[PDB]
Amino acid sequence: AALSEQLAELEKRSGGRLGVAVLDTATGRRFGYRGDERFPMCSTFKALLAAAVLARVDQGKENLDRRITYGKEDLVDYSPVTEKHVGDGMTVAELCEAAITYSDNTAANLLLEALGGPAALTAFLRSIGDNVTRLDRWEPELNTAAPGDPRDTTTPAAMAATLRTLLLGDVLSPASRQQLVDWLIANKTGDKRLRAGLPADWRVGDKTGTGEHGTTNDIAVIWPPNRAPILVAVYLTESQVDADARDAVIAEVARLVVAAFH
């Protein structure tokens, strides 16, 4: 495979450690570059958080319209949505949207408490067959991204398989499935990452993550026109180029991936 070689060249220039997984649902195969190495999730976990929330909505243990109230004491850094709604609160559905489409940290923390904390999300993931991904801390502590730390990590391959299970398998209702898809499709944080290397006709839902030690991630479900989706997980950490160049690394991965498909 020349794809593996291109990603190794790209990884060299980034100065860090690059992980890539592609899962093609039309076939069932999957590609990996460091796909079984641990990487810090940063905000990419928030997709899995909204999935677990939706499961309890499926179970009748939670409601999409339930309004959660909170105060300024609950607000953590980078909370561009929740910081506007302390006076009126926000519904669980609104928090999910904020968490996914803006990486709102306070929304994630509030959703994490309504679920039962990091251990709860981690237990949900084991219940759906993901034995690798783990969430250990809250926002913003889970973004430390220390090079040898297993807390708050996934692997590209595990994240890809989890996305597959959640977005197209049988763990969520079809309604909860479509809702999670629509949130990812409306993400506002990823325009410089995977989206920027994809052909414009391709429909795309994604969740980004950003953290210390030059960490820049993006995970996605992508539908080529008339064709089964693929799942793509990209994690970059310990990188030594600036933010704009780390974004460019992710975009080029998206390009190197689609070219590999033609």
Side-chain angles (χ1 to χ4, degrees), residues 8-162:
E9 304 271 274
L10 185 60
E11 174 175 73
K12 294 188 183 73
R13 333 206 318 257
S14 72
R17 191 163 59 90
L18 176 65
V20 180
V22 186
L23 212 173
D24 182 339
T25 60
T27 167
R29 311 241 165 249
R30 67 144 167 120
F31 168 91
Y33 183 90
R34 309 201 186 270
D36 297 296
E37 298 188 20
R38 288 193 172 275
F39 288 82
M41 277 185 293
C42 303
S43 284
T44 60
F45 86 95
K46 287 166 182 167
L48 313 182
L49 174 59
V53 172
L54 288 167
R56 310 237 213 131
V57 168
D58 286 339
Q59 301 169 28
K61 335 251 294 192
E62 168 64 276
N63 201 267
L64 272 199
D65 301 285
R66 176 174 77 97
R67 173 161 306 276
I68 301 198
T69 47
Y70 55 96
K72 255 182 139 210
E73 65 269 9
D74 298 287
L75 296 165
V76 294
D77 283 352
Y78 194 75
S79 292
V81 174
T82 49
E83 72 184 9
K84 315 286 206 304
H85 289 281
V86 309
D88 55 322
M90 305 170 60
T91 69
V92 167
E94 294 170 327
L95 285 148
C96 285
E97 179 174 342
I100 287 170
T101 70
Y102 282 88
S103 279
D104 192 296
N105 277 339
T106 300
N109 280 353
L110 293 170
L111 287 173
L112 269 172
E113 211 153 7
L115 185 95
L121 175 60
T122 297
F124 169 72
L125 295 172
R126 303 286 176 272
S127 83
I128 68 176
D130 185 336
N131 306 125
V132 174
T133 305
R134 51 182 290 183
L135 186 77
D136 296 82
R137 290 168 294 174
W138 301 75
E139 293 287 7
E141 277 77 13
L142 62 97
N143 300 294
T144 51
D149 196 335
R151 289 174 306 179
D152 307 298
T153 61
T154 196
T155 66
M159 182 61 77
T162 292

Side-chain angles (χ1 to χ4, degrees), residues 149-197:
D149 196 335
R151 289 174 306 179
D152 307 298
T153 61
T154 196
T155 66
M159 182 61 77
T162 292
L163 288 187
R164 187 192 192 176
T165 291
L166 290 172
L167 306 164
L168 321 161
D170 266 16
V171 153
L172 300 184
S173 73
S176 287
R177 188 183 328 239
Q178 256 297 328
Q179 184 57 272
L180 186 53
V181 164
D182 299 335
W183 287 331
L184 294 157
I185 283 177
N187 176 35
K188 303 286 189 298
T189 66
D191 291 351
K192 299 302 189 205
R193 295 181 187 194
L194 285 171
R195 287 169 186 267

